[PDB]
Each structure stands twice: as C-alpha cells, then as structure tokens.
C-alpha cells in the first residue's frame, strides 16, 4: 500500500525493472523500487542479448 512504502535504495537487492534493459521513465524514487542492468543489485536477466550471439 502507499504511504510508508519504499525503503530499498542503499543495501538491498532491488527487483529488476519491468523493462530490464529498455526502461524509459526515470524518477529519483523509481531507481530505489526497481533495479536496472549496470547496478550492483540488478537481478532480472531476462534473455537480453544472450552473450551477444544473435547472428
Ligand atoms: Zn526502471
């Protein structure tokens, strides 16, 4: 529920964002609720490139 919900922006494993590598919105509090590739807590790994072998 809202009001008193959102405290994971320091030492926690954030959940990967619904876009994973294509996120488009960007807020100061969204980075704390969803993780992204390139962060020490990213953990989505939903087949985005696969060892760069798409030829
Ligand atoms: Zn995001």
Rg (CA), the chain: 13
Determine if residue 28 is labeled as part of a ligand binding site: no
Domain of residue 17, residue span: 12-37
Measured CA to CA, the distance from residue 22 to residue 33 in angstroms comes to: 16
Measured CA to CA, the distance from residue 35 to residue 55 in angstroms comes to: 29
For residue 32, the SS3 value is helix
For residue 15, the cross-strand partners are 34
Please give the method by which this entry was determined.
Answer: NMR
Determine if residue 14 is labeled as part of a ligand binding site: yes
- CA of 43 from ligand 1 middle (Å) equals 13
Rounded to 5 degrees, what angle do the CA atoms 34, 18, 53 make? Answer: 110
Question: Would you give the distance in Å from CA 14 to the centre of its chain?
Answer: 7
In terms of Cα–Cα distance, which of 24, 20, 27 is closest to 42?
20
Measured CA to CA, the distance from residue 25 to residue 27 in angstroms comes to: 7
Measured CA to CA, the distance from residue 14 to residue 16 in angstroms comes to: 6
Which token pair is 44? 């989505």
For residue 16, the cross-strand partners are 35
- CA of 34 from ligand 1 middle (Å) equals 6
Measured CA to CA, the distance from residue 44 to residue 17 in angstroms comes to: 7
Determine if residue 19 is labeled as part of a ligand binding site: yes
């Amino acid at each position: 529920g809202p009001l008193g919900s959102g405290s994971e922006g320091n030492k926690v494993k954030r959940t990967s964002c619904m876009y994973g590598a294509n996120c488009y919105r960007k807020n100061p509090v969204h980075f704390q609720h969803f993780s992204h590739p390139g962060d020490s807590d990213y953990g989505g790994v939903q087949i985005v490139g696969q060892d760069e072998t798409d030829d």
